[PDB]
Nucleic acid binder design. Structure first.
Lengths: 10, 10
DNA sequence: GATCGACG
DNA sequence: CGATCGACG
């Protein structure tokens, strides 16, 4: 996720 | 699929 | 991070 | 055609 907590996705 | 019956996938 | 989202 | 298809941070 994110960042943070990428995306998703990427 | 295949082709035939792409891949999967692509 | 959370049973992750977006190319024949 | 196919089949709850399968493989970039």
């Amino acid at each position: 996720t994110x960042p943070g907590v990428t995306x998703p996705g990427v």
